[PDB]
Design a protein around this nucleic acid. Structure first.
Lengths: 89, 50, 41, 234, 39
RNA sequence: CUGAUAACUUACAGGACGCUUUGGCUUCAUUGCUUUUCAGGUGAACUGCCGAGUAGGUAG
DNA sequence: ACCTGAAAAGCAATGAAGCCAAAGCGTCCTGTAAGGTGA
DNA sequence: TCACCAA
């Protein structure tokens, strides 16, 4: 069973406003955006893994859950660098 | 380039007619005369070097 | 202190006479005099 | 017999086709895509068996993106690396041994070298088969791409590569097959219960044809000591 | 809390006056302005 | 059955100050556009009457 | 009621394209996270 | 568990 979607948003911003795409993880320019070639232009994109982490913010099943967390082993939070569902628990 | 005649320029091909273009100014037919007008200034620039 | 002046001239030259504006710093015939210029209308 | 898959648009693939070259992804990745597209359809029709596949690439765009690896046990991330990725928009023309619309779309494979590959819903009209190559290549839209043909010029060295990379500035080298290091044996842990041998990559140069039909079509060739995706015309 | 503003100003400069935008960092022009594209 | 499977790079930011391109100038001598040429299909819608009516009305 | 737009030849040579001087200094380029083996 | 190590 397959169930393709095709999603399209429409953002009404302020005048002349910033946009925040995902940006690269390498090892000068200190904020290098991810990009793809659409027609002949460079265009900022949001990742295929930056996207899939947002569909899977589900976890509020932990012992002290006040906010949903991205679904993973020993479910991590990157605001405060901690592991809810730590293995000693 | 030297001075002997070119053998391509025959009698027929040198009586062939040669069309060109000029600007042509003249007085109109019923006119009387022509004015011409300008102005001169005499200055003292020669007193010292620029 | 601010003091803005708006200045305006009026030159009466001879018939068909010559006017001399400032001229640019240039960095089979080569231009020997290139004027500074602005777009009006 | 030439089934046409148009606008297979991979978002984030890998450009590390070898441990040596970066660029377009490897040609055992485009082969494993088709032989997953075959092997799904062999659930219903058990004799599908693609023979060869024509690749038409538009719009590579190789780039260094990032890879946030997952936290692994003292619980912190593993070692930090650097990863090149590419965003291919290609189109694919098969060669079948002999099917609904909705049988094809649910049996497409969904990863081409770590990257999600998709056809748009509005492009589903162009999955129809044909009989002659001259109509199947005039069939697909967005015509402006180069077919992949191997540069079969004798070479032995990197200077042999770089000399051919300047007479053709559009020539791109990548991984074409796997050169073994021992004979495949029975191991206690193997990938899916088969015989396992250790291999190394093989780097070839890859042309681009304007459009020799056999040369354009690629296939899997087994050599008692390697395995290389060659065109038919070699 | 969100509170978006939309500011618009109107400058009456003198005749043929000068306007001073922000200007770029560079590593021969001695004053290079920051710019965009509008029309 | 893809150097396979799994994968959030993030957060902050004032480029500025000053600046006379100027001087000189002769484009110009010469000149034959000509020769010839059928728009036709008008036998249709006439001839009276009133009125000062070169206007305007009316009969068959 | 429709149909037609003519051919035949030519488009000149002579000479020149000036110089001279210069291209400023002060000051800076951020930090935090992410180890495989061995006693 | 910790002392080991570079361009």
């Amino acid at each position: 069973g397959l169930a393709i979607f095709e999603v399209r948003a429409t953002l009404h911003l302020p005048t002349n406003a910033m946009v925040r795409p995902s940006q690269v993880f390498t090892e000068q320019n200190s904020r290098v955006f991810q990009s793809t070639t659409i027609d002949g232009e460079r265009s900022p994109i949001l990742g295929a893994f930056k996207t899939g982490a947002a569909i899977a913010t589900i976890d509020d099943w932990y012992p002290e859950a006040t906010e949903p967390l991205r679904v993973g082993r020993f479910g991590v939070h990157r605001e405060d660098v901690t592991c809810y569902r730590h293995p000693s628990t | 380039v030297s001075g002997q005649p070119i053998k391509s320029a025959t009698a027929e091909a040198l009586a062939q007619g040669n069309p060109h273009q000029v600007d042509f100014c003249h007085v109109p037919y019923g006119a009387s005369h022509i004015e011409c007008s300008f102005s001169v200034s005499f200055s003292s620039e020669l007193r010292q070097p620029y | 202190g601010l003091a803005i002046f708006e200045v305006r001239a009026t030159l009466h030259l001879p018939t068909n006479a010559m006017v001399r504006p400032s001229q640019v710093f240039t960095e089979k015939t080569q231009n020997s005099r290139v004027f500074q210029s602005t777009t009006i209308d | 017999s030439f089934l046409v898959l148009p606008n297979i648009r991979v978002c984030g693939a890998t450009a590390l086709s070898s441990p040596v070259t970066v660029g377009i992804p490897s040609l055992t990745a485009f082969f494993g895509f088709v032989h997953a597209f075959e092997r799904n359809i062999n659930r219903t029709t058990s004799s599908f068996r693609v023979e060869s596949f024509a690749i038409c690439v538009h719009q590579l765009h190789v780039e260094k993106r990032g890879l946030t690896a997952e936290f692994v046990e003292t619980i912190s991330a593993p070692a930090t690396r650097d990863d090149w990725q590419c965003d291919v928009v290609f189109s694919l023309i098969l060669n079948t041994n002999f099917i609904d619309q909705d049988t094809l779309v649910t049996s497409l494979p969904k990863r081409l070298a770590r990257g999600s590959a998709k056809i748009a819903i509005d492009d589903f009209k162009h999955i129809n088969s044909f009989s002659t190559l001259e109509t199947a290549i005039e069939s697909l839209p967005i015509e402006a791409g180069r077919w992949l043909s191997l540069y079969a010029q004798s070479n032995n060295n990197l200077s042999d590569l770089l000399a051919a990379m300047t007479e053709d500035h559009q020539l791109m080298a990548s991984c074409v097959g796997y050169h073994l290091l021992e004979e495949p044996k029975d191991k206690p842990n193997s990938l899916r219960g088969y015989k396992h041998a250790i291999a190394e990559c093989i780097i070839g140069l890859i042309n681009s044809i304007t459009f020799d039909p056999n040369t354009i079509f690629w296939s899997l060739k087994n050599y008692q000591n390697y395995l290389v995706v060659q065109p038919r015309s070699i």
